[PDB]
Symmetry: C2
Subunit: 166 residues, 2 copies
């Protein structure tokens, strides 16, 4: 039940609820269980729950412009996609007319804050809730273990030197 | 004296690259010439730590003050590829062009040098050697002085740890990366 160390395959296989986007694209696509957080203007500064979001809910896939190295023209909204253990392409969520609402979700600062894991399944990126999100709480994402490892990034539950030499 | 002159324009080895270790190390220590090989090869500035009442080696200690920036090695052991590998406790990986190339295996004491006896550090605070691949070899570099009669304790340098998807001293947390 602790999803911290699940593999991308385990997220896909053991997901309970699937939430599709709502039928500018980045704003219009926001599912009906979410709301935007706004600046004190109409600038969107994050995504919040409108209602209780269960653990084990999948959002996505991420929509954005796709670039390879040979085709790439701002990298803050980039997500990397891998094939057979090599970087294959980027999905770029920067352009709000060609990207969905996932571009607005802020990153978690700590394991405690994280309530979404980002995973690559197939050729897509999804965000899975790893804990319940009560109403009117911010969605805060970080890479799942396998994705973090592909990036050489830290992640919740990462083993320490102390762990590896115990 | 004071100020801009002595300051000039802008020593911690924690985040050095493998190239930096090779370029900037100060002292080189070669193995003892030469011979069992794993014991006979131990450099004259080191001693073994033994199990109590036993001749069993359980670690490596300094015999004398070992300066920061001292290189030991290269590692010697049997070399296996995936296509030739026959207990991985004493295995070290060698990479070529970002891909695993072969393993150096220190298990057999007749075919390996003293570096097989060096134990891993349990924490950043305990580490006094960084292991690096330079060229086709692995060397250990002291990252802090080792006073006389203190154990040598190794961990991978940052780039080697990252090839292994291992943690390392100085690794940034999510907290550091996000603010």
């Amino acid at each position: 039940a602790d999803m911290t160390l699940w593999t991308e395959a385990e997220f896909e296989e053991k997901c309970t609820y699937i939430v599709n986007d709502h039928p500018v694209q980045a704003e219009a696509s926001l599912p009906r269980n979410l709301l935007f957080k706004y600046a004190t203007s109409e600038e969107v500064i994050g995504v919040m729950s409108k209602e209780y979001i269960p653990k084990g809910t999948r959002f996505g896939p991420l929509i954005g412009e796709i670039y390879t190295n040979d085709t790439v023209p701002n990298r803050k909204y980039f997500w990397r996609i891998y094939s057979r253990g090599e970087l294959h392409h980027f999905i770029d969520g920067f352009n709000e007319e060609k990207s969905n609402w996932m571009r607005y979700v802020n990153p978690a600062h700590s394991p405690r804050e994280q309530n979404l894991a980002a995973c690559q399944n197939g050729m897509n990126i999804y965000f899975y809730t790893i804990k319940p999100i009560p109403a009117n709480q911010e969605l805060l994402v970080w890479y799942c273990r396998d994705f973090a490892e592909r990036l050489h990034y830290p992640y919740p539950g990462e083993l320490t030197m102390m762990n590896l030499t115990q």
